[PDB]
RNA sequence: GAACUUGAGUGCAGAAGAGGAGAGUGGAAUUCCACGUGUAGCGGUGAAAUGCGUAGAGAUGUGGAGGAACACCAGUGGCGAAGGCGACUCUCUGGUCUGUAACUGACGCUGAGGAGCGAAAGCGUGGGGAGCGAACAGGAUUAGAUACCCUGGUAGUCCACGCCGUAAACGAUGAGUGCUAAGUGUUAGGGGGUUUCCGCCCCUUAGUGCUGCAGCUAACGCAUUAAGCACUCCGCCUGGGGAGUACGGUCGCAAGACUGAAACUCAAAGGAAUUGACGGGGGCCCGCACAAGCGGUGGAGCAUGUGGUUUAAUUCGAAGCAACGCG
């Protein structure tokens, strides 16, 4: 596929962007892997850091 | 390898049936179709006499009571010795019916196998009888082991 | 009552079905061992079907009709038990595939052949 | 002694990382606790039994306690000298890589001895204990079963500091440097050729995979991440056993570690590969081999042959299938 963050040029993912993180997160609550969303390695690292921080502030779920 | 099949002869000069000659070939001891034909026709003449009916329909009713739907085969996995129930294909239904008629008739004990086969058909007609113990018990073994199918 | 949730927990030994009420109050329960199967037949989906049939009969005896069925535990008889809740006069609307997933937690007991 | 900037290092600029140490916090799940639902099982196995359970369990709903590991990300991905390091957040802190040109100007490499780190188990002291779990107990299995299996469960696993100082501590491959075809993924960078982009291509680093030429090798294989071609330095080997033993010494609370023989004994031990045979390894297939049936043998009587034993001789030969109504 195509990477999101290379396309839209956007850098540090800004945990407040709950809708974008909600796009990358799967239906139950898990982080989708890199071969599903198509991102880079680096951007998947910043994505998973963002999702874990937004989970601990209940901006994102853990289990559904 | 593959499956091989066999044949059988169509008529009987009285009682024109395939399966009655199939019973003639059954219960043949030591290569004597003559004795089994004599036993069979004297038995069916008793079935025509003792009950005022044609013995063809009584004989098919006895078959219908005996023909088993469900054999229970074997399946040993590990140390388990499970028996597995099999839907019987109808050729083996007829032939297990004939074996149970013949075996439990000659196992009964009366003053000819003429009389034993006649009374075993008369018992298997009104279903309660000696071979139908084996029919019921095979269906009970399939009923108990139905968890495997 | 009319609505409840059917908790099926089918594991490699037993397939236990408890039909409970929505804020968790068990109306009736029956297992694969309650039906009479004592051996390994407890694991077979025929026993899970039978256990769902008896739990469904008890639930209709108390009167509930529309379930919301939660499959729990790794076994074999989950699909037949969902199907047998349908064929016994009930409705299975939602299917909650909820086996208890630890994230990392406690360590499991040792592997078997060692 | 004077000069140089490539090696080395400082400066500036970014980048990435489970690099470390201290504190705080989270969400599953597990156990336990209290209460409601409710009834007869649960658990477990190849099969069961011990356990748990009508004194109300397992299931289920809510609440609480407490400990430990951090699903998905997650990847021949990253970092570290190695051990190793996966939740999150901050505090302090180590290293690396990339672009140079500002500086230094050989400041470098290696390193016995020394000093340190050093998985896991173990030890000391104090806490901690949810799961697991040596030991131990019960149940099974079995000829036996101090085992595998099952049910329980102590130390330990966890934390603080101190000791041990060992691993198949592995890449079974010392460190440094230079040279010696390619193809190909990928990680963190840089620059270029159109486009502001998306992005394609080209180019270059440092790390990380695979296939591969020359070359090497006993072969397997390695091959720019060398096991090639060289130079420097260190460590280590000289048949197998005895034996990493004994003695001595050092270190250690201990367990032990390190150093380390000899008498005696053998003509082998060993590596890699080849042909077979075998496997309670995988695949395919076949045969009265199995199943599906039918009739028997094993029981009785006799016929017959053979072992023993009686014998003057009980002639000799056959001896699992493949001897025994055989010569």
XYZ file of C-alpha atoms (C1' of nucleotides) in Angstrom:
654
model
C 0.000 0.000 0.000
C 0.833 3.668 0.456
C 2.052 5.367 3.633
C -0.201 8.006 5.194
C 2.412 10.262 6.732
C 4.641 10.399 3.671
C 1.602 11.346 1.594
C 0.220 14.138 3.757
C 3.693 15.221 4.901
C 2.583 15.315 8.503
C 5.085 14.909 11.331
C 4.809 14.312 15.002
C 1.443 12.670 15.202
C -0.021 14.793 18.074
C -2.012 12.457 20.417
C -4.893 14.979 20.322
C -5.524 13.663 16.753
C -7.882 11.031 18.146
C -9.679 10.489 14.835
C -6.488 9.612 12.943
C -5.405 7.170 15.658
C -8.935 5.772 15.559
C -8.421 5.157 11.846
C -5.218 3.170 12.393
C -6.582 1.174 15.360
C -8.530 -2.004 14.537
C -12.149 -2.754 15.419
C -11.525 -4.336 18.807
C -8.926 -1.799 19.857
C -5.655 -3.249 18.672
C -3.045 -1.441 16.635
C -3.139 -2.626 13.052
C 0.207 -3.950 11.802
C 2.351 -2.314 9.174
C 1.297 -4.666 6.378
C -2.343 -3.621 6.802
C -2.025 0.157 7.066
C 1.001 0.326 4.803
C 2.989 2.876 6.810
C 6.732 3.078 7.300
C 8.667 1.530 10.129
C 9.401 4.963 11.672
C 5.839 6.169 11.301
C 4.508 2.947 12.806
C 6.789 3.546 15.795
C 5.439 7.051 16.343
C 1.910 5.713 15.743
C 2.211 3.028 18.416
C 3.735 5.482 20.893
C 0.817 7.824 20.170
C -1.779 5.076 20.591
C -0.321 3.890 23.908
C -0.297 7.433 25.327
C -3.835 8.096 24.085
C -4.953 4.815 25.621
C -3.677 5.853 29.025
C -5.736 9.043 28.884
C -8.851 7.122 27.698
C -8.768 8.921 24.358
C -8.517 5.411 22.854
C -9.874 2.064 24.091
C -8.015 -1.015 25.200
C -10.559 -3.824 24.817
C -13.841 -3.956 22.929
C -7.908 -52.446 -5.715
C -11.375 -50.970 -5.941
C -14.839 -52.336 -5.219
C -16.074 -55.555 -6.823
C -19.733 -56.589 -6.944
C -21.668 -59.847 -7.187
C -24.898 -61.238 -8.659
C -27.897 -63.424 -7.816
C -30.721 -65.225 -9.600
C -34.137 -63.615 -10.164
C -36.973 -66.190 -9.746
C -38.311 -68.902 -7.418
C -40.929 -71.228 -9.055
C -43.365 -70.442 -6.289
C -42.819 -67.038 -4.567
C -41.066 -65.197 -7.440
C -38.591 -63.037 -5.508
C -34.928 -62.097 -5.779
C -34.326 -61.971 -2.052
C -35.986 -65.305 -1.322
C -33.432 -66.995 -3.567
C -30.889 -64.824 -1.755
C -32.110 -66.551 1.423
C -31.853 -69.875 -0.443
C -28.153 -69.216 -1.094
C -27.888 -68.232 2.567
C -28.438 -71.054 5.166
C -26.948 -73.467 2.617
C -24.822 -75.968 4.498
C -22.014 -77.724 2.610
C -23.234 -76.875 -0.878
C -26.843 -78.107 -0.741
C -29.322 -75.751 -2.376
C -31.787 -78.648 -2.507
C -32.135 -78.939 1.262
C -32.392 -75.165 1.694
C -35.028 -74.937 -1.040
C -36.964 -77.722 0.667
C -36.676 -76.008 4.077
C -37.703 -72.678 2.575
C -40.787 -73.810 0.676
C -42.016 -76.066 3.480
C -41.511 -73.130 5.857
C -43.404 -70.672 3.671
C -46.170 -73.215 3.256
C -46.369 -73.279 7.061
C -46.499 -69.468 6.980
C -49.338 -69.626 4.440
C -51.159 -72.252 6.512
C -50.728 -71.159 10.151
C -51.576 -67.576 9.273
C -54.063 -67.251 6.434
C -51.975 -64.809 4.404
C -49.611 -64.855 1.475
C -46.156 -65.337 2.913
C -44.456 -62.797 0.615
C -45.906 -59.816 2.490
C -45.279 -61.365 5.909
C -41.704 -62.035 4.821
C -41.138 -58.444 3.705
C -42.657 -57.194 6.983
C -40.223 -59.393 8.914
C -37.365 -58.026 6.799
C -38.517 -54.439 7.441
C -38.482 -55.122 11.169
C -34.992 -56.635 11.051
C -33.100 -54.402 8.518
C -30.820 -52.220 10.678
C -30.375 -48.536 9.915
C -27.236 -48.108 11.998
C -24.325 -50.485 12.367
C -21.730 -49.479 14.928
C -18.235 -49.920 13.484
C -14.952 -49.745 15.436
C -12.496 -46.855 15.898
C -9.609 -47.325 18.319
C -7.573 -44.151 18.803
C -5.057 -44.353 21.621
C -6.407 -46.557 24.388
C -10.052 -45.683 23.874
C -11.745 -48.559 21.932
C -14.581 -46.348 20.667
C -17.361 -47.780 18.528
C -18.585 -45.458 15.756
C -22.120 -45.661 14.264
C -22.471 -46.074 10.499
C -25.518 -45.432 8.338
C -25.921 -48.791 6.623
C -26.338 -48.834 2.842
C -29.408 -50.880 2.044
C -27.763 -53.920 0.474
C -26.145 -54.594 3.830
C -29.518 -53.895 5.457
C -31.066 -56.789 3.533
C -28.111 -59.088 4.105
C -27.847 -58.387 7.834
C -31.592 -58.989 7.973
C -31.153 -62.354 6.289
C -28.231 -63.304 8.565
C -30.239 -62.419 11.657
C -33.297 -64.357 10.411
C -31.186 -67.416 9.591
C -28.936 -67.332 12.662
C -31.585 -66.728 15.291
C -33.956 -69.173 13.595
C -31.477 -72.052 13.794
C -30.491 -70.844 17.255
C -34.113 -71.080 18.465
C -34.752 -74.848 18.521
C -37.876 -76.708 17.344
C -38.680 -79.900 15.419
C -37.348 -78.700 12.035
C -35.724 -75.531 10.637
C -38.888 -75.468 8.571
C -40.644 -74.636 11.848
C -37.840 -72.437 13.198
C -37.722 -70.259 10.085
C -41.529 -70.126 10.006
C -41.824 -69.074 13.638
C -38.934 -66.635 13.315
C -40.670 -64.936 10.388
C -43.900 -64.949 12.417
C -42.082 -63.346 15.341
C -40.212 -60.802 13.253
C -43.484 -59.804 11.605
C -45.087 -58.783 14.906
C -41.757 -57.196 15.725
C -40.973 -58.851 19.132
C -38.610 -61.759 18.433
C -35.126 -63.221 18.823
C -33.290 -61.582 15.898
C -35.027 -58.323 16.709
C -33.176 -58.404 20.008
C -30.083 -57.967 17.835
C -31.833 -55.245 15.784
C -32.798 -53.322 18.937
C -29.378 -53.838 20.523
C -27.493 -52.559 17.475
C -29.701 -49.474 17.454
C -29.012 -49.113 21.196
C -25.270 -49.319 20.576
C -25.642 -46.641 17.912
C -27.809 -44.604 20.275
C -25.206 -44.731 23.030
C -22.263 -43.915 20.753
C -24.045 -41.167 18.798
C -21.506 -38.539 19.932
C -19.139 -39.453 17.095
C -21.276 -40.063 13.964
C -38.883 -12.457 31.763
C -38.037 -12.072 28.082
C -34.387 -11.174 27.566
C -31.221 -12.720 28.915
C -27.694 -13.566 27.820
C -26.457 -17.112 27.236
C -22.955 -17.720 28.541
C -21.432 -20.724 26.801
C -18.004 -21.789 28.053
C -16.821 -24.714 25.939
C -13.358 -25.934 26.897
C -11.460 -29.100 25.956
C -13.196 -31.059 28.679
C -16.615 -29.478 29.202
C -19.106 -27.293 27.370
C -21.033 -25.503 30.131
C -24.048 -23.419 29.105
C -25.627 -21.040 31.629
C -28.529 -18.896 30.458
C -28.409 -15.845 32.701
C -30.257 -12.562 33.001
C -28.832 -9.393 31.466
C -27.415 -7.990 34.689
C -26.093 -11.468 35.382
C -28.664 -13.665 37.108
C -28.667 -17.328 36.096
C -32.099 -18.589 35.122
C -31.074 -22.172 34.366
C -27.846 -24.017 33.701
C -26.906 -27.365 32.196
C -23.550 -28.766 31.174
C -22.261 -31.549 28.979
C -21.699 -33.572 32.140
C -25.164 -32.759 33.461
C -26.708 -34.435 30.426
C -24.932 -37.621 31.460
C -21.773 -37.725 29.330
C -18.998 -38.360 31.817
C -16.041 -39.296 29.657
C -14.289 -37.513 26.833
C -17.684 -37.244 25.128
C -18.104 -34.075 27.210
C -15.783 -32.440 24.651
C -17.792 -33.584 21.640
C -20.145 -31.058 19.988
C -23.059 -33.465 20.312
C -22.883 -32.986 24.076
C -22.676 -29.212 23.595
C -25.751 -29.399 21.365
C -27.606 -31.457 24.004
C -26.534 -29.131 26.822
C -27.753 -26.130 24.846
C -31.049 -27.968 24.217
C -31.629 -28.566 27.922
C -30.631 -25.012 28.851
C -32.982 -23.731 26.144
C -35.839 -25.845 27.495
C -35.260 -24.471 30.999
C -35.062 -20.910 29.692
C -38.368 -21.260 27.842
C -39.767 -22.798 31.047
C -38.958 -19.485 32.699
C -40.006 -17.665 29.562
C -37.155 -15.716 28.000
C -36.956 -15.544 24.218
C -34.250 -13.283 22.786
C -30.740 -14.144 23.915
C -27.388 -12.443 23.433
C -24.900 -15.275 23.371
C -21.294 -15.097 24.616
C -18.902 -17.856 23.535
C -16.052 -18.303 26.008
C -13.249 -20.839 26.297
C -11.256 -22.876 23.747
C -13.076 -26.100 22.951
C -15.022 -27.568 20.054
C -18.759 -27.356 20.664
C -19.385 -23.623 20.288
C -20.945 -23.642 16.811
C -23.311 -26.550 17.416
C -24.457 -24.994 20.680
C -25.218 -21.667 18.980
C -27.108 -23.600 16.286
C -29.011 -25.603 18.912
C -30.138 -22.470 20.744
C -31.712 -21.416 17.447
C -33.442 -24.725 16.690
C -34.892 -25.074 20.204
C -37.189 -22.055 19.914
C -34.927 -19.123 20.830
C -33.260 -16.291 18.954
C -29.493 -15.770 18.929
C -28.963 -12.152 17.948
C -25.430 -11.097 18.898
C -22.431 -13.421 19.101
C -19.791 -12.277 21.588
C -16.598 -14.228 20.890
C -15.152 -13.471 24.312
C -12.458 -15.889 25.435
C -10.479 -14.481 28.384
C -7.400 -12.926 26.809
C -4.668 -12.042 29.295
C -2.352 -9.431 27.877
C 0.798 -10.849 29.414
C -0.155 -11.644 33.039
C 0.729 -14.787 34.936
C 2.930 -17.464 33.417
C 1.178 -20.611 32.172
C 1.762 -24.076 33.615
C 4.529 -26.026 31.929
C 4.287 -27.710 28.550
C 3.133 -31.247 28.746
C 5.601 -33.789 27.391
C 8.591 -32.532 29.426
C 63.745 18.885 15.141
C 60.419 20.912 11.495
C 55.927 20.194 8.197
C 51.008 17.486 6.340
C 45.759 15.547 6.849
C 43.787 10.783 5.031
C 43.992 7.436 10.537
C 42.191 9.253 15.529
C 39.562 12.987 18.170
C 37.151 17.776 19.366
C 33.461 21.647 17.102
C 28.614 22.541 14.593
C 24.042 20.375 12.634
C 20.353 16.847 12.666
C 18.384 11.340 13.279
C 17.051 6.867 15.409
C 17.080 3.464 19.318
C 13.239 -2.447 24.392
C 21.022 1.580 25.971
C 21.109 2.190 31.499
C 19.550 3.793 36.569
C 15.417 6.104 40.126
C 10.415 7.287 40.975
C 5.112 7.328 39.517
C 0.875 5.318 36.807
C -2.189 2.123 33.774
C -5.432 -2.228 31.274
C -6.469 -7.139 30.377
C -6.051 -11.753 32.924
C -4.986 -15.142 37.130
C -5.868 -16.148 42.365
C -8.401 -14.978 46.835
C -12.333 -12.444 49.536
C -17.874 -10.665 50.433
C -22.882 -10.687 48.383
C -26.925 -11.782 44.747
C -28.637 -15.830 40.583
C -29.088 -21.308 41.223
C -28.596 -26.343 41.180
C -25.293 -30.709 40.737
C -21.763 -31.036 39.223
C -16.780 -28.940 38.294
C -11.874 -30.081 37.260
C -8.757 -33.442 34.618
C -7.231 -37.491 31.270
C -4.949 -41.773 26.101
C -8.627 -43.937 30.026
C -9.589 -42.651 34.930
C -8.756 -41.326 39.751
C -7.043 -38.069 43.580
C -8.736 -33.036 44.499
C -12.930 -29.150 44.673
C -18.688 -29.538 45.691
C -25.389 -29.425 48.694
C -21.478 -26.579 54.838
C -23.852 -24.573 47.799
C -19.016 -25.394 44.164
C -17.748 -24.724 38.626
C -20.667 -21.044 35.485
C -22.415 -15.841 36.165
C -22.941 -10.409 37.993
C -20.741 -6.457 41.212
C -17.065 -4.779 44.573
C -12.322 -5.152 47.047
C -7.258 -6.911 48.207
C -2.579 -8.218 46.216
C 1.466 -9.702 43.309
C 4.006 -10.503 38.811
C 4.442 -10.131 33.235
C 3.651 -6.074 29.873
C -1.331 -8.887 24.260
C -1.981 -6.002 19.436
C 2.922 -2.859 17.653
C 6.458 -7.205 16.815
C 9.814 -7.390 12.084
C 16.537 -12.466 9.655
C 13.361 -4.477 13.299
C 16.515 -1.432 16.789
C 20.105 -0.546 20.757
C 24.255 -2.559 23.860
C 31.139 -4.909 24.637
C 28.869 -9.158 26.178
C 25.273 -10.750 29.649
C 21.168 -8.617 27.610
C 17.057 -4.871 26.892
C 9.683 -4.822 25.050
C 3.237 -0.936 28.915
C 3.384 4.323 29.750
C 5.460 8.987 31.820
C 9.042 12.129 33.918
C 14.208 12.764 36.488
C 19.426 11.929 35.730
C 22.712 9.555 32.215
C 25.988 6.238 28.346
C 26.955 5.179 23.331
C 26.086 5.225 18.083
C 25.071 6.844 13.015
C 24.809 10.619 9.214
C 26.624 15.846 6.640
C 30.707 18.176 6.542
C 34.418 21.525 7.111
C 35.874 24.949 11.822
C 40.020 23.078 14.854
C 44.087 19.417 16.760
C 47.867 17.101 13.933
C 49.580 10.534 14.577
C 47.096 12.234 19.736
C 46.572 5.492 16.977
C 45.915 -0.283 17.302
C 46.424 -4.306 20.564
C 46.982 -5.609 25.431
C 49.579 -10.663 29.661
C 48.970 -9.172 34.798
C 45.214 -5.712 37.128
C 40.110 -3.384 37.566
C 35.055 -3.936 36.155
C 30.489 -5.943 33.889
C 28.673 -10.730 33.736
C 22.039 -15.055 31.894
C 20.153 -18.591 35.124
C 20.507 -21.303 39.474
C 22.588 -20.678 44.364
C 24.081 -17.873 49.193
C 23.326 -13.665 53.397
C 20.054 -9.964 55.474
C 15.077 -7.586 55.227
C 10.600 -7.454 52.627
C 7.063 -9.992 49.166
C 4.048 -13.982 47.387
C -0.895 -13.578 42.227
C 0.427 -17.384 38.913
C 4.193 -21.034 38.270
C 6.953 -24.402 40.723
C 12.196 -27.888 42.336
C 11.651 -30.675 46.943
C 7.611 -33.269 49.098
C 2.415 -35.710 49.298
C -1.760 -38.078 47.071
C -3.834 -40.426 42.318
C -2.833 -42.954 37.830
C 0.447 -45.729 34.458
C 3.680 -49.749 34.961
C 6.721 -55.980 35.921
C 8.763 -51.836 38.887
C 7.623 -45.877 37.962
C 11.782 -42.382 43.667
C 9.569 -40.625 35.992
C 6.768 -38.607 31.945
C 0.593 -37.666 32.911
C -3.007 -35.611 36.828
C -4.156 -33.138 41.500
C -1.687 -30.285 45.410
C 2.453 -27.583 46.947
C 7.810 -25.635 49.855
C 12.221 -22.898 48.616
C 12.779 -20.072 44.523
C 10.919 -16.911 40.673
C 9.822 -10.673 42.519
C 12.310 -6.198 45.252
C 16.679 -3.539 48.186
C 21.825 -4.117 49.092
C 25.945 -7.531 49.440
C 28.323 -12.283 47.636
C 28.905 -16.225 43.427
C 31.414 -15.457 38.756
C 29.410 -19.822 36.053
C 26.366 -21.382 30.555
C 25.697 -25.113 23.903
C 28.203 -17.265 27.981
C 27.257 -19.538 20.288
C 28.457 -16.669 14.851
C 30.506 -23.291 18.474
C 33.936 -17.626 14.006
C 39.382 -12.345 19.107
C 40.205 -7.179 18.230
C 41.973 -3.434 14.641
C 42.834 -1.908 9.525
C 43.231 -2.125 4.218
C 42.260 -4.566 -0.347
C 38.954 -8.569 -3.435
C 32.543 -9.494 -9.062
C 27.607 -9.163 -8.788
C 22.027 -9.566 -7.623
C 18.635 -8.538 -3.737
C 15.278 -7.250 0.540
C 15.454 -4.020 4.809
C 16.919 -0.127 9.281
C 18.610 4.963 10.365
C 20.803 9.015 7.359
C 22.645 12.310 3.066
C 22.806 14.286 -2.024
C 21.216 14.617 -7.220
C 17.317 14.445 -12.047
C 11.516 16.864 -13.449
C 7.700 17.990 -10.143
C 5.841 23.056 -4.679
C 4.144 17.736 -3.885
C 2.737 12.535 -3.988
C 6.438 9.764 -5.495
C 10.025 7.264 -9.051
C 15.024 6.828 -10.620
C 20.126 7.600 -9.723
C 24.182 8.172 -6.141
C 26.620 7.482 -1.253
C 27.279 6.113 3.833
C 26.903 2.922 8.575
C 24.154 -1.286 10.322
C 21.303 -5.790 9.192
C 19.320 -10.683 5.813
C 19.581 -14.135 1.557
C 21.522 -16.038 -3.117
C 25.980 -15.903 -5.468
C 32.237 -14.977 -9.073
C 37.249 -15.349 -7.992
C 39.604 -17.256 -3.803
C 39.581 -20.739 0.417
C 38.227 -25.587 2.560
C 38.942 -32.449 4.151
C 34.014 -31.764 3.046
C 29.685 -29.174 4.742
C 30.055 -24.731 3.304
C 32.170 -19.327 3.847
C 32.286 -15.645 0.344
C 32.866 -7.263 0.885
C 28.917 -8.829 7.964
C 34.945 -14.121 4.950
C 35.929 -19.248 6.413
C 39.576 -14.962 0.621
C 44.447 -12.024 0.103
C 47.611 -9.547 3.878
C 49.871 -6.891 8.103
C 49.701 -5.909 13.808
C 48.621 -7.684 18.580
C 46.378 -10.983 22.157
C 44.347 -15.624 23.810
C 44.555 -20.747 22.984
C 45.805 -26.357 20.699
C 49.313 -30.369 20.219
C 45.964 -38.443 20.365
C 41.626 -40.637 23.640
C 40.850 -41.894 28.753
C 42.356 -41.097 33.715
C 40.475 -35.593 34.157
C 39.149 -30.543 34.574
C 40.642 -35.449 38.647
C 44.106 -35.375 42.924
C 47.619 -32.229 45.660
C 49.204 -27.192 46.571
C 47.817 -22.044 46.305
C 44.339 -17.890 45.640
C 39.250 -16.333 45.992
C 34.229 -17.677 48.364
C 29.680 -17.589 54.213
C 28.899 -21.962 51.534
C 28.033 -24.312 46.963
C 32.176 -23.928 44.260
C 35.448 -21.056 40.868
C 40.457 -20.423 38.895
C 45.241 -22.730 38.299
C 46.288 -27.834 37.218
C 49.160 -32.621 36.792
C 50.948 -37.976 37.491
C 51.122 -43.196 37.967
C 48.236 -46.262 34.807
C 45.707 -47.415 30.258
C 44.209 -47.642 24.460
C 45.517 -47.760 19.121
C 42.427 -45.558 18.447
C 39.159 -41.165 19.889
C 37.454 -37.630 16.051
C 35.330 -34.371 11.815
C 32.677 -34.128 7.023
C 30.663 -36.959 3.390
C 28.979 -41.774 0.800
C 26.316 -46.597 0.224
C 23.006 -49.290 2.888
C 19.890 -50.995 6.964
C 16.636 -49.350 10.585
C 12.973 -45.622 12.961
C 7.334 -46.475 18.254
C 9.862 -40.297 11.170
C 7.083 -38.113 6.663
C 4.828 -39.596 1.550
C 2.853 -43.224 -2.092
C 1.450 -48.135 -3.146
C 0.498 -53.385 -3.023
C -0.708 -58.786 -1.241
C -6.585 -63.460 2.098
C -2.027 -59.113 5.059
C -6.354 -56.222 7.901
C -11.432 -55.363 7.788
C -16.423 -57.796 5.493
C -17.903 -62.824 5.596
C -17.819 -68.297 5.357
C -15.625 -72.626 7.386
C -12.255 -74.504 10.723
C -7.875 -75.681 14.241
C -7.142 -75.206 19.948
C -11.758 -79.238 23.486
C -13.115 -85.385 22.511
C -11.944 -89.932 19.846
C -8.750 -92.008 16.475
C -4.818 -91.644 12.141
C 0.064 -89.338 11.575
C 4.734 -86.741 12.396
C 7.902 -84.402 16.165
C 9.999 -83.316 21.076
C 11.097 -85.622 26.069
C 11.181 -90.374 28.719
C 11.743 -95.556 28.499
C 14.880 -98.364 26.361
C 19.493 -103.694 23.854
C 18.057 -100.743 19.812
C 13.686 -97.225 20.011
C 18.573 -96.017 12.899
C 19.653 -91.458 10.568
C 18.292 -86.570 8.497
C 14.768 -81.582 9.154
C 14.322 -77.583 13.663
C 10.676 -69.892 13.749
C 8.381 -67.988 9.281
C 11.443 -71.398 5.523
C 11.258 -78.526 10.969
C 6.950 -81.436 12.622
C 0.687 -86.649 7.118
C 8.657 -83.749 5.918
C 13.136 -87.440 3.270
